């Protein structure tokens, strides 16, 4: 556009998202465990 290389960084957001959402599966790990703890 007015700042090029706006097709590499757009795929880095996608990369990061696939990491984060497994770190929210680390909360679904905890989820079963707070049932087992109580």
């Amino acid at each position: 556009n007015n700042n090029s290389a706006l097709s590499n960084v757009n795929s880095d957001i996608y990369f990061k998202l696939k990491k984060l959402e497994k770190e929210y599966e680390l909360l679904t790990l905890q989820e079963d465990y707070i049932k087992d703890e109580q």
């Binding site: 290389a5 097709s7 590499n8 757009n10 795929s11 880095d12 996608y14 990369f15 696939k18 990491k19 770190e23 599966e25 680390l26 790990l29 905890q30 465990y33 707070i34 087992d36 703890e37």
Partner: protein, 832 residues
């Protein structure tokens, strides 16, 4: 308008009228889908028939109706059963839902077919249509721009060959920095996303080769692949490329970087190959590791700043007569004087030292090997007055001098190993006498440090006999030392021998020591050590379950695995022995060194529980995981545990905080000052138990450690990869309650932070401003500070790289090489 004619035309008998029916249904289906959802079998019937060539047109309708219905999976099958008139909808962005569902299906299938063979897309293992679709969807990525979109898609689909071709399209030197960054993202992604061993290894290995093809590249990225896979062959090939790019500064810079990052196994193998290939002795001298030990000594000398009132206050309150008091001071004192010969405290407070006795005096002797750590030329000549054959006043001094010898030479003690092995084989035939017993104990700890990460089978033999001797106190050191020497080899004879011997022996100290040692020797064994883990947890002995936790911890250390973490959570809650509950919590920080952001939340639950041991192990898990530069959540959870009404939780907490806030200035964070001040309030007070005072004195000495020059590093910023040495220090420290001398193993986690610029032609919150201030070479530089340091635009010394922004050796280019300028002197030069 109405579906009634369109239903009726399918039921009307004539072949032409049935074909006309399809034509109307296909054009208007976003208003009429509900009615023809019920009459779907008629649409499938015309497709089955071969008397039509609009059998395809009927299959296309079925997909459309399923898309409005909500059954997106079955739409794909009938979309691919039409085969044409599906390109019309592949360039529709309002129904690209079915086009995307085909790719979502491909990924699930592919995880299965990679364990049958790595190739299943150049073979008939799956539908040919699904493969063809996958690559046309990746073709769309390249219309947008930039292979990068396609690379994330192909990773999940287990397409190795796609990844190679994309990256070679960027091997024409469009721009070398950009081309390396394109590879760089995929390196970090591969560690954190795919844990499949086969696929992960391939991506790093192919990337490593594309980097070599380019003449100019980051040699950070090349360094990462070699260390992660820990392959000496890749390291050798790296230097094959440097054989044709050989100059003193370039070839040395990568060598300095490599020794810090690489494991002990990788260096041992690599140097010999360079010797057979033929290479300068200057490189081989770096890769031995001696130069970098000398440079750390010089840095400590220059910046030796020791606040003297800490020692005076602690000395007066923690009396030398009481064993617990004296040891607390000794452990803080050795940390304080680590790496610089400081015997001034010893001279000044000789009466207080003279109050020491039984194992407190052994601790005092072992303090020496922290103080004189490093300084390897004088390291055997400064313990000589205390080594056997020069002392007979007490056996504690004769024994703890050998333990401190191993500290001094830890990590480079291949010659020290020989000394202590002789002492062991002599005194492995008798351990019933008092003198022999204390003597043998320090030797067995010493040789664990001296042979650490060397896996000497001579050392295994020697300590195996001490174990079989059934010594009263040396069996504990023998077990631990063997796991130090045999680190992460996982030999089946050793495991089986040790697993049975804890049953065989009835001594309490030995059974603890073998439980812990089994974890050490199975460090980094993830699924290979799985079976041992199962056996130890299933044991109803308190002892084997205590170690059971740490075999998971060290097997899966620094791995983002749910199963590794999962198992530890289970033990903590479900087990009704307190010591076993504590061990499960501590272990958590080791698995989650790689990511410690999430850690305080997991143990938030555990701190709510009011059992002393559970809260006690919560403190340690937080100290371990969130050491280095702090985390606000970590601080918060520990604060109530500092004020706990139970001494055991208080002692744990004060220390854990000092790791999180290690060497952080109180002008950069006000909370550090309060926490510092709290420790001092206890050290002064003489109305609390010695347990609280023990933990306060030590915690304060940890904060100020090394003369305020060292910090805890878990993962280097040199490559962003875990340190082997770090993990070993910390887990040994956690055993200090049971046996006090083990405190000293913490020194393995203290590492100096400084930027040492070296002339490579002879080897000689939110503070920011646009106004610089100037800083000298080789002074204390915190990681916060590193990112704000930048070499001057016009400078006599300019780094070959553009500065990495983190502590370590950076090789400089000297603009004028014939000018003599002041040099900072090396300890090696000082002596002789």
């Amino acid at each position: 308008t109405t579906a009634a004619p369109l239903l009726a035309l399918l039921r009307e008998n004539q072949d032409s009228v049935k074909t006309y029916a399809l034509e109307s249904i296909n054009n208007v289906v976003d208003q009429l889908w509900s009615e023809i959802s019920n009459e779907l079998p008629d649409i499938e019937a015309l497709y089955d028939d071969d008397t039509f060539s609009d059998r395809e047109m009927a299959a296309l309708i079925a997909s459309k109706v399923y898309y409005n219905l909500g059954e997106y999976e079955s739409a794909v099958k009938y979309a691919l059963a039409a085969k044409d008139r599906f390109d019309i909808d592949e360039k529709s962005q309002f129904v690209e839902t079915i086009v995307s569902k085909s790719i979502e299906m491909y990924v699930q299938e592919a995880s299965k077919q990679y364990t049958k063979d790595e190739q299943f897309y150049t073979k008939d293992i799956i539908d040919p249509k699904l493969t063809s679709i996958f690559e046309r969807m990746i073709e769309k990525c390249l219309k947008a721009s930039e292979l990068k979109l396609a690379l994330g898609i192909a990773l999940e689909g287990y397409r190795l060959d796609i990844i190679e071709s994309a990256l070679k399209s960027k091997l024409d030197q469009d721009s070398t920095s950009e081309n390396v960054k394109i590879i760089n993202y995929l390196l970090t992604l591969a560690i954190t996303t795919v844990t499949n061993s086969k696929f992960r290894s391939s991506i790093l290995r192919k990337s490593f080769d594309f980097l070599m093809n380019m003449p100019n590249c980051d040699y950070l990225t090349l360094n990462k692949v070699v260390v992660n896979l820990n392959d000496a062959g890749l390291a050798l090939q790296l230097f094959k490329k440097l054989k044709e790019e050989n100059d003193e500064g370039l070839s040395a810079q990568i060598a300095f970087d490599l020794v810090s990052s690489a494991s002990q196994q990788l260096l041992e193998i690599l140097v010999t190959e360079l010797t057979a290939q033929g290479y300068d002795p200057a490189l081989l001298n770096i890769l031995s590791g001696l130069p970098t030990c000398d440079y750390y000594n010089t840095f400590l000398l220059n910046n030796k700043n020791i606040d003297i009132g800490l020692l005076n206050k602690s000395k007066s309150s923690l009396d030398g007569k009481f064993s617990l008091f004296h040891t607390a001071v000794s452990v803080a004192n050795g940390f304080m004087h680590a790496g610089t010969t400081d015997n001034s405290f010893i001279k000044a407070n000789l009466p207080w030292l003279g109050k020491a006795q039984n194992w407190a005096k052994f601790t005092a002797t072992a303090s020496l090997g922290v103080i004189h750590k490093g300084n390897l030329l004088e390291g055997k000549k400064v313990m000589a007055p205390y080594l056997p054959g020069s002392r007979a006043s007490s056996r504690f001094i004769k024994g703890g001098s050998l333990y401190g010898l191993g500290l001094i030479y830890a990590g480079f003690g291949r010659d020290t190993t020989d000394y202590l092995k002789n002492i062991i084989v002599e005194n492995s035939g008798t351990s019933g006498d008092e003198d022999v017993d204390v003597l043998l104990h320090g030797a067995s700890l010493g040789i664990g440090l001296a042979a650490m990460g060397s896996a000497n089978i001579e050392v295994y033999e020697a300590l195996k006999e001490v174990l079989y001797n059934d010594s009263a106190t040396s069996g504990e050191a023998a077990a631990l030392g063997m796991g130090l020497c045999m680190l992460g080899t996982g030999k089946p004879e050793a495991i089986h021998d040790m697993f049975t011997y804890s049953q065989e022996t009835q001594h309490g100290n030995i059974t603890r020591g073998l439980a812990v040692g089994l974890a050490l020797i199975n460090y980094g064994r993830q699924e290979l050590a799985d079976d041992l883990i199962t056996k130890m947890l299933a044991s109803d002995e308190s002892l084997l379950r205590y170690g059971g936790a740490f075999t998971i911890a060290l097997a899966y250390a620094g791995t983002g695995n749910n199963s590794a973490v999962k198992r530890l959570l289970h033990v903590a809650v479900s087990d009704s022995n307190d010591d076993v509950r504590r061990a499960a919590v501590i272990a958590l920080g080791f698995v989650l060194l790689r990511d410690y952001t999430t850690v305080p939340r997991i143990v938030q639950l555990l701190s709510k529980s009011h059992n002393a041991h559970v809260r006690c192990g919560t403190a340690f898990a937080l100290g371990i995981a969130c050491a280095g530069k702090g985390l606000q959540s970590a601080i918060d959870v520990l604060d109530p545990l500092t004020k706990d009404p139970v001494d055991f939780v208080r002692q744990a907490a004060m220390i854990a905080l000092s790791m999180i806030l290690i060497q952080q200035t109180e002008k950069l964070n006000p909370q550090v000052a309060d926490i510092n001040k709290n420790f001092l309030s206890v050290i002064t007070n003489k109305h609390q138990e010695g347990l609280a005072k023990f933990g306060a004195c030590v915690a304060q000495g940890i904060m100020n450690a090394g003369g305020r020059n060292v910090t805890i590093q878990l993962e280097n910023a040199d490559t962003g990869t875990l340190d082997t040495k770090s993990v070993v220090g910390l887990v040994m420290f956690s055993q200090f309650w049971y046996w006090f001398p083990l405190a000293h193993f913490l020194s393995l986690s203290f590492t100096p932070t400084t930027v040492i610029g070296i002339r490579g032609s002879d080897q000689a919150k939110n503070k920011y401003s646009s106004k610089p201030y100037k800083v000298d070479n080789m002074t204390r530089i915190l990681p916060q500070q590193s990112r704000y340091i930048s070499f001057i635009k016009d400078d006599r010394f300019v780094p070959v790289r553009k500065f990495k922004g983190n502590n370590g050796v950076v090789v400089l280019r000297d603009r004028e090489p014939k000018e003599p300028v002041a040099l900072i002197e090396t300890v090696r030069q000082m002596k002789d």
